[PDB]
Symmetry: C2
Subunit: 160 residues, 2 copies
């Protein structure tokens, strides 16, 4: 059979704080597929971002990029610094984090946010809608842990 | 004890009794020593997939954290040459912004602090490094809470 779902009461409460875990595309730092390998490497080391979403000039999701992705590509094809200043990031884009849909179940988001630091949210047409981070989920989880008892009563159950 | 807004005692009880393994021990956490040369640390951080790593002393005592952005910022601050950077240990570029939590910290405080930082170094009263609590390990426990809380508890509308 299929696995367990999160309690309907928890899913109901968290869906009243949707604004918290979904971070819109306009508030998320991104790189374009046509951007320079060396330039985004210098930028990733200055900003100190583990990995950043890569999108196209028409705002469509491509993958993610990190310093370790660029550095692995440099070793793989023995590319010099001058050659890296002429290479776009399309060729070294990480596609391991499978993007979730806008209509994803909160039970799936909770399972996937454990595995990845962030989940890119896309439309059925692959338009980058934004990201869901471990931090934004924990903000909503924190409100749940403090305010769940405002609309709900929890009583212990004895199974013995 | 005049405590403020606390997490529900039922949630705190469940998280403490079933999945208290969110306190990743010091033996399972990758670390750097404060004497490790900056360039080799930078090369290691760029080879492995790590945003920032805890820095402990030779005597397993907490010092701070290190990231590529910490080393690179120190390099431009003093426009240091690559041979000057080779001799340099990471203890001069260490990041002490993440204030370590105590072993005796409340779960309510851990939950407020894990939102702010990707991980919380857990230390003793003598600053002995005990391990870390990550956003990932907290989310594993939170996931078990969201699925199995109703095993020992009944939730009814108020
Ligand atoms: Pt690099
Ligand atoms: Pt560097």
């Amino acid at each position: 059979p299929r696995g367990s779902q999160i309690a309907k009461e928890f899913e109901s409460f968290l869906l009243s704080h949707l604004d918290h875990y979904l971070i819109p595309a306009e508030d998320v730092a991104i790189f374009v597929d046509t951007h320079n390998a060396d330039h985004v490497m210098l930028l990733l080391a200055s900003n100190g971002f583990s990995r950043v979403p890569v999108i196209t000039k028409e705002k469509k999701y491509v993958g993610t990029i990190s310093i370790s992705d660029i550095m692995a590509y440099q070793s793989k094809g023995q590319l010099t610094d001058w050659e890296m200043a002429q290479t776009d990031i399309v060729e070294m884009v990480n596609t391991k984090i499978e993007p979730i849909n806008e209509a994803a179940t909160l039970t799936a988001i909770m399972h996937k946010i454990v595995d990845y630091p962030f989940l890119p949210v896309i439309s059925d047409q692959n338009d980058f809608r934004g990201i869901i981070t471990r931090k934004s989920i924990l903000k909503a989880i924190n409100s749940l842990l403090h305010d769940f008892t405002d609309e709900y009563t929890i009583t212990p159950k004895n199974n013995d």
